[PDB]
Nucleic acid binder design. Structure first.
Length: 33
DNA sequence: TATATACAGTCAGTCAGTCAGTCAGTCAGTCAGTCAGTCAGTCAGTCAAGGGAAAATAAACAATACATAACAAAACATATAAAAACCA
């Protein structure tokens, strides 16, 4: 029923992440080398 | 001889004339107060130049307005993979 007011389909979205490394150890002691 | 009645005389009051003051009603000067033309002096209406600042002109020179080209910035909008919830 809805209509998008303007289309982007030839987009090529890149599979790249927004979570930095700062948020996959969660502590100073929690980090490997 | 004396007393009572009437008539005529006599004073006084009343009646009429004499003359010397007096005031109302006019006559009228005169004196003063108020109305007519000349002129001479007053006074504003009117017919003309001309003074002079505004208006117009001109020329060299300066400042502002207008239309637009280029762009900056903020609101409105979508898409999809990715986090993080979030169902189950």
């Amino acid at each position: 029923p809805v209509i998008r007011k303007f289309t982007k389909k030839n987009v090529a979205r890149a599979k790249k992440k927004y979570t930095p490394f700062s948020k996959r150890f969660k502590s100073i002691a929690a980090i490997p080398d």
